Amino acid sequence: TTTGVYRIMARGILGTYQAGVGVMYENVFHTLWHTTRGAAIMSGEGKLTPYWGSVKEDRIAYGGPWRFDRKWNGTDDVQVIVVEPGKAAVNIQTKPGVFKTPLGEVGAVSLDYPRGTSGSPILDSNGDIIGLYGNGVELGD
């Protein structure tokens, strides 16, 4: 289906560049807010506009609500479908680092990639997306 991982490409005065990455899942395109800042995005003579968004959470969904609801168990490795600018997609298996915040316990990917890689999905062993790279994951069973 249209389900998959997509480069968010942009073109303007700065030529063509990769603004970020997002995921189409259950007819909703998910990415990070700072990537698009709520701008419209084309999908082949078909424009998508924000349905839901949070600046503070830095998350945004086009065409419907945020669909991902699974969390990291805080034990097992995860895989990031890394979509770097100017390189083919790759799966990278890694162990997130647990970090405590006033809002709750959080996991983050220790890997470092260029700017436009943000939004690359993080999967658990079941293939469920538990967060986007550059935004992290939540803890829970």
Binding site: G4, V21, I41, M42, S43, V83, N91
Partner: peptide, 21 residues
């Protein structure tokens, strides 16, 4: 001038066994 944003498919959503190996 023109500013546009669009989507370009890069991968399927999937776990890969080889990535573990």
């Amino acid at each position: 001038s023109e500013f546009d944003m669009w989507l370009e498919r890069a991968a399927d959503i999937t776990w890969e066994m080889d990535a573990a190996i």
